[PDB]
Design an enzyme around this catalytic site. Structure first.
Site, short mmCIF file in Angstrom:
data_model
loop_
_atom_site.label_atom_id
_atom_site.label_comp_id
_atom_site.label_asym_id
_atom_site.label_seq_id
_atom_site.Cartn_x
_atom_site.Cartn_y
_atom_site.Cartn_z
N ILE B 158 1.46 -1.07 -0.09
CA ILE B 158 -0.27 -0.25 -0.04
C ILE B 158 1.29 0.96 0.48
CG2 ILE B 158 -2.22 -1.06 1.22
CD1 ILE B 158 -1.53 -0.24 3.37
N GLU B 159 0.10 2.54 -0.70
CA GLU B 159 1.23 3.91 -0.93
C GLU B 159 0.72 4.99 -0.57
OE1 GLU B 159 2.68 4.77 -4.82
OE2 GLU B 159 3.99 6.30 -4.20
N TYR B 192 4.27 -1.04 3.71
CA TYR B 192 3.65 0.67 2.90
C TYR B 192 4.67 1.24 2.79
CZ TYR B 192 1.85 3.92 5.94
OH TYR B 192 0.39 5.47 6.25
N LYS B 193 4.25 1.53 1.79
CA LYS B 193 5.05 2.57 0.98
C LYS B 193 5.24 4.16 1.17
CE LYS B 193 4.97 4.09 -4.15
NZ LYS B 193 5.75 4.28 -5.41
N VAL B 194 5.79 4.77 1.63
CA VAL B 194 5.44 5.66 1.86
C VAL B 194 6.70 7.33 1.89
CG1 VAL B 194 7.41 6.70 4.14
CG2 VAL B 194 5.37 7.46 4.27
#
Ligand SMILES: [Br-]
Ligand SMILES: [Br-]
Ligand SMILES: [Br-]
Ligand SMILES: [Br-]
Ligand SMILES: [Br-]
Ligand SMILES: [Br-]
Ligand SMILES: [Br-]
Ligand SMILES: [Br-]
Ligand SMILES: [Br-]
Ligand SMILES: [Br-]
Ligand SMILES: [Br-]
Ligand SMILES: [Br-]
Ligand SMILES: [Br-]
Ligand SMILES: [Br-]
Ligand SMILES: [Br-]
Ligand SMILES: [Br-]
Ligand SMILES: [Br-]
Ligand SMILES: [Br-]
Lengths: 291, 291
Positions: B158-159, B192-194
């Site tokens: 998810i981003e 998790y892509k942040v």
């Protein structure tokens, strides 16, 4: 002994992958332009210079330094890698007409015996080329400079650089580059360091043609410098130059100029400048392989 | 079988060094902005996309692709390196208010069984975060997306991406980033892509503090993306992020955006983009070593 050999500043493959950090007032202006507080102190220049040398010299076959800001310091702090050789600038830059190097002479406060004693293998001389200035006067300077090197067992590197004429508006950079080469391309130095034609811009074929033309007029090994070429277009410039007869590069700005003014200089030099120089050396090795 | 493992998209060291080329209309605009002739054809995007994949994937542990412009093409042309794994975007971007991705939904025309059959190991979902939009509605979408992945033996990435509110002018990007993490940082995805806090700018210590704060609210492995961070400051951003708990990066623009619009794309990708990605992977290996 006063035996000298080109092999001492090349990689194993025989190509030149060399780093220039001898920029002087020209660098102070870069720091100013990047938003460093003014007036920029000398210690900022030598700090950056010796950092660049210690972090990047492991990737270069030579590194070019200046007495004014970092020659003493680099030897003192053993900043130059073992595998990398040392060139010392032997030019005294004179400002004028609002620029920091309007005119160039041979630096008299250079002791080639001292410098050779510190492991230096070569000296470098910038030569400003103007169409309405005396060619014989240039040639003389190069001759004096060649003897200073060779009689001390040092290599001789010349860097003709093309400037518009003193009186007049006729200036065709490309032709001037070629005219300087006709004049100085067989002056008995050991290495010719030259600007890239067309700023390394445009189509690969037009570049190859211009670099070929140029190579025709240089009767010694030659390399390209990065001033004028965008850092992203320099890797290609080197490929084309060497496909045309050049044996490598002696570059500075395209390696480290982007990093000036940013936080964490040693890290920036390591993460941004180093991968670029590394690539460039990989490229020269690839092109020597093709010979 | 529907067994999936994070190990399939990490390097040997266990860190994430991943390449994103799934940008769509956002890339057409980059090409336009670099002075490519308009209107920019789709084939220019897939050409650049598959070139980037074939030249850069040898350096990545995964590569993120989009069905719209290059998923078919990359498998067809075996563009992805053997050593690199494949993520497929599962988001349908909706334009609005003059931007190309104003809203995001789950892409229904995605066959996870097909994609898994082509060797894909993961899907990715962008999630736009707005303070005055319904959190439960976001969470639901992520849940649906997690099942789509996990029931098909795929990983879930998810981003969350932070946008100003629909009605209002109260927008503090930093807080929003952290609020999104509080909300989605334990939603049962695998990754998790942040965004990087403070755009990776300023002093290293202020960054470390902000990245630490953030890491506190993420209960899964996380990585930083490069959008917003200058490419020169991204190598550091990754170091700080990982010192704070992050396990790598999933980056695009900072690898290849500088090369858009220049002559000789394959060479540019090789000489300019590749050394940057290579360095970044070296860095994650170094930071995993420190654990
Ligand atoms: Br070597
Ligand atoms: Br100054
Ligand atoms: Br420094
Ligand atoms: Br070397
Ligand atoms: Br000047
Ligand atoms: Br001329
Ligand atoms: Br160009
Ligand atoms: Br080539
Ligand atoms: Br530093
Ligand atoms: Br690896
Ligand atoms: Br367009
Ligand atoms: Br292309
Ligand atoms: Br890998
Ligand atoms: Br957008
Ligand atoms: Br907010
Ligand atoms: Br900064
Ligand atoms: Br570090
Ligand atoms: Br090309």
């Amino acid at each position: 002994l006063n035996n000298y050999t080109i092999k001492d500043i090349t990689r194993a493959s025989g190509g030149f992958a060399m780093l220039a950090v001898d920029q002087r007032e020209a660098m102070r202006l870069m720091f100013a332009a990047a938003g460093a507080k003014t007036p920029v102190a000398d210690s900022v220049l030598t700090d950056f210079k010796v950092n660049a040398a210690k972090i990047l010299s492991p990737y270069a076959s030579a590194v070019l330094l200046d007495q004014q800001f970092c020659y003493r310091q680099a030897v003192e702090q053993n900043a130059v890698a073992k595998s990398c050789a040392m060139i010392v600038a032997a030019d005294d830059f004179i400002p004028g007409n609002g620029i920091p190097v309007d005119n160039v002479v041979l630096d008299k406060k250079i002791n080639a015996q001292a410098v050779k004693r510190d492991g230096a293998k070569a000296l470098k001389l910038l030569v400003l080329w103007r169409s309405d200035e005396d060619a014989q006067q240039r040639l003389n300077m190069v001759k004096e400079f060649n003897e200073l090197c060779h009689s001390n067992g040092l290599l001789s590197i010349i860097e003709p650089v093309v400037r518009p004429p003193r009186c007049g508006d006729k200036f065709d950079r490309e032709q001037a580059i070629i005219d300087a080469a006709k004049e100085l391309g067989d002056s008995g130095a050991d290495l010719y360091k030259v600007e890239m034609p067309l700023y390394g811009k445009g189509a690969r074929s037009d570049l190859l043609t211009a670099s070929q033309r140029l190579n025709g007029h240089i009767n010694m090994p030659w390399v390209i410098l990065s001033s004028g070429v965008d850092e992203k277009l320099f890797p290609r410039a080197v490929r084309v130059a060497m496909e045309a007869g050049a044996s490598g590069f002696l570059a500075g700005r395209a390696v480290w100029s982007s990093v000036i003014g940013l936080p964490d200089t040693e890290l920036m030099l390591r993460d941004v400048s180093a991968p670029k120089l590394q690539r460039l050396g990989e490229i020269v090795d690839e092109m020597m392989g093709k010979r």
